[PDB]
Amino acid sequence: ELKILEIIKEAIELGASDIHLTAGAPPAVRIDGYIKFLKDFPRLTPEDTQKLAYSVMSEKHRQKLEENGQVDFSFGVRGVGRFRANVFYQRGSVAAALRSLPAEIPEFKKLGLPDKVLELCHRKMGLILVTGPTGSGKSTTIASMIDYINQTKSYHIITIEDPIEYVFKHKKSIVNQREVGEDTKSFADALRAALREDPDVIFVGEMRDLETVETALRAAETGHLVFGTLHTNTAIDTIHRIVDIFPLNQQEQVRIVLSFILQGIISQRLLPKIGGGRVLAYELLIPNTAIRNLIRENKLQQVYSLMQMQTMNQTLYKLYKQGLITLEDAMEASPDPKELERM
Amino acid sequence: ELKILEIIKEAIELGASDIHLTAGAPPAVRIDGYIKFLKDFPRLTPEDTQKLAYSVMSEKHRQKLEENGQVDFSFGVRGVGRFRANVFYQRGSVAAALRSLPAEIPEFKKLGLPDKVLELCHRKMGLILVTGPTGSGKSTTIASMIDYINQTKSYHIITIEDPIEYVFKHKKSIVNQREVGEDTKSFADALRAALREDPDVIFVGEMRDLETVETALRAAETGHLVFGTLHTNTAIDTIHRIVDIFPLNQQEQVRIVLSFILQGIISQRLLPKIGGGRVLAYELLIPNTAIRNLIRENKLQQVYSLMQMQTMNQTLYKLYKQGLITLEDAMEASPDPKELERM
Amino acid sequence: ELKILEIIKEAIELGASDIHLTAGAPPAVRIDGYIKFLKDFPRLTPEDTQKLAYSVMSEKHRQKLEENGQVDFSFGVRGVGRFRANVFYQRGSVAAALRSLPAEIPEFKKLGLPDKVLELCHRKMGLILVTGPTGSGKSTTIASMIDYINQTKSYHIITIEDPIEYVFKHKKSIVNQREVGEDTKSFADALRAALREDPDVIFVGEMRDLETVETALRAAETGHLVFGTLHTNTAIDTIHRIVDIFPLNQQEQVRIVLSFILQGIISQRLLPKIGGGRVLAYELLIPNTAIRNLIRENKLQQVYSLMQMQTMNQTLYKLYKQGLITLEDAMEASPDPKELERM
Ligand SMILES: Nc1ncnc2c1ncn2[C@@H]1O[C@H](COP(=O)(O)OP(=O)(O)OP(=O)(O)O)[C@@H](O)[C@H]1O
Ligand SMILES: Nc1ncnc2c1ncn2[C@@H]1O[C@H](COP(=O)(O)OP(=O)(O)OP(=O)(O)O)[C@@H](O)[C@H]1O
């Protein structure tokens, strides 16, 4: 009956994205974004959601769920795959939200980016930034690139994540992934340890604290290729942001350094497609002879004009002329309506 | 005799709003706002108000009432309903103030708002703000809306409250309610956990600390519909307030963000009615094509002029022309007498 | 089989720079900068990388790897040499990165610097600064100089390092090396203890905190010859930097003091050579009668012009006219292209 391992069975069996456990109701499941209660077998759950949750939690997690009202952790079931779990107290009673963790890195062509992007993965050092709002394929793009390196280079890759989304098998290189909160205390002191761990590639899950970006740039300018993720929407947004989070006492020297070490920037958005509904739009900036200097001279508004690698709106039109994204979709995604409509 | 469970019996039997326990007197009761001592059965209470209070308190509550001079907690009696209890030391002796907690969410038509409000509950993401002073129906309006969603959408609703006023049954969706101080340490780290708990709707009981509003806006602009409650009196008050509690280093960018994500604002006041005495007045602002831009350009005084959804005074006149609220009632409730009197 | 001591055997046997231990894969090895998995003997490693790592760790290290997710430590195997080890948690599982520590200080002529440098090692007191980015031979140059003193002077040398790179045998003098994190708590309170330890020569591994540079300069101006290492690229960079990290309340008095006590500055870069690939370029400034005063009068841009000891670009041309470093190599290494190309 009420066995967590069997609840999971039925969830993937129905292609569920999430499962939810709360007292009053039977086990719930999110399918296509709709919550459905799998009455199938299990009946309305007693306060012994606590019993189910526990059958999955470590001892330092159960400790934690007491010290504070919630835990965020991952667990693996050999049968199927891996799962992210947030357990918490609801109405004096125990509640849980399990998520499915991706079991397979997509092929690069599957994504939507051009092959001009893959050229970044061959650069010897510098910063590769993939940005965009939560749910625009940032983690996917990175995983595709890190695994592309993994297939082709004899490197030592190190990733610092929150949480570990996709997982890597050893191939031509040797991959180590560290989860903040489980393997290490912080992005920062993990990235600091990373400098002494002989890595070829370093991947910061997120760069939200300044101290991290400060270590992230240090690494980049010291022989490493570093992958980083922001939440910005354009490329100019990105460069402006990481600069304008430093004290303006040598914020100009950030612009100098970034301009040497910034290797490429990809900003992503997932718009609805006409087939299966899933299409990626993007801004792409791989700096060259000219671009490099404009950033040093902080002439960023004039940078946009040289961009013919490809501006965000150009990606929108290209996706429209072929016939995938609609006009208003192409318009609501657009940073500036004025550049389009002209198309 | 002196049995807490029986005292409660007699209180609802007389339709009491509160019951009060203190040493010198017999158990007291608030009926229609007047304190009456139910001599009925129980006699003048000994210092063993402590005995009664305890028969209702958890162990971490009795601990707390020692560590500090008071506790605030909720407890449920299957017989009738749920009760909020504040226990504290009076004159070296134990005292208690129990409140009745609402056992049934009202129908939306019962309230007083138009059906234009219910359209908010269908919005995919953004901020729904219900404001007003304590005792203007904020919690009621929200409960009516969250339960309306609950009846019609297959969502996962999460509320973070202080305390949990109304309680929800699972219906078409799956509802989780977390009480700050019992299930979680803070609004903020509960709202932070909320982001990882796969919710469709998030409800912040109160947004008094900036850090909360900062997370609340983040959630809103990241795919969630978020319900929030202030203490402001007008809609312009509201927008001005949440903006002017951010450091003015990017306080202008709050105005930009709010204008994209602010879905509707309802400000409420409960004026005396001629029948049973209970009528709601309100200001309603659902932004559209034009309004959106005025807020970005911080032209808020000119926003008022476009409002014909409905200004606070228009609600007052409408309630008067029909014959419910008196002239001075309509005047003392009014933000500006000058707009009315002209009616 | 799986014996750490034997894994090491095979690594030096193949002339490895690093060895890497992680669960999924067999023991890895970096040869010529390429990761190769030595399937030779050991098979795919179980989570009992933990077993191997432990056979090398002290008790306060194994404690540490628990308190925090990683340790950085050194260990010695009589058979071959010494090894730097960073152990850390990867995917809930134990991972390790061992480095080879240099077993023999090079002859000074082997380096690339002129004999004008060795004259510094005979100075009675002052500051000798070797600078450059990680991997430009800073530690080598110092070790060559300290050991040169060791062979010829009856001194008491003290070094404070992070970690102890090269190790010294007692010769004509008596050498003491202290590792920050193992023998002492900090560079600073080690340098502070150094003042009371009767040393002739003091060597600060790194001078990143101001408090250190403040003690480092104190020592210099108090009878000691002090060796220090920065990350700057030019000599003017160096002097400007250490000055501009003091509060400008008496930052001018730093310029006065530095100008008395700065004995020499060497800034290094390792460019690719045509033979074995390994050649050193450098900027050299040994102040004299005139130079001393220019620094007091902060006329540093005019200092460059008097430099005919030798400017960075002059070193580049000299290495090119002989035929070692290529034009673009000489150009990309150059601080200013404009000075060269004229050659
Ligand atoms: N380029 C793409 N085209 C179509 N679908 C994609 C693409 N990238 C990702 N997806 C899908 O969309 C969902 C969200 O992707 P992903 O998690 O990579 O984005 P993200 O939220 O920016 O990353 P993160 O996990 O760091 O927040 C996933 O289920 C993924 O399979
Ligand atoms: N629209 C309304 N019309 C008439 N009576 C109402 C209305 N809304 C609430 N009431 C009644 O008035 C009292 C106060 O309502 P409520 O507690 O919702 O207001 P509030 O104090 O603003 O909310 P909160 O509990 O967050 O302070 C309740 O007893 C409720 O039944």
Ligand SMILES: Nc1ncnc2c1ncn2[C@@H]1O[C@H](COP(=O)(O)OP(=O)(O)OP(=O)(O)O)[C@@H](O)[C@H]1O
């Ligand atoms: N002058 C030189 N010429 C050729 N090779 C050198 C020279 N100096 C050092 N090397 C080699 O280059 C590598 C890096 O040298 P070293 O570690 O001294 O530089 P560094 O990184 O500046 O010092 P540190 O250990 O303080 O970071 C070593 O393997 C060393 O053998």
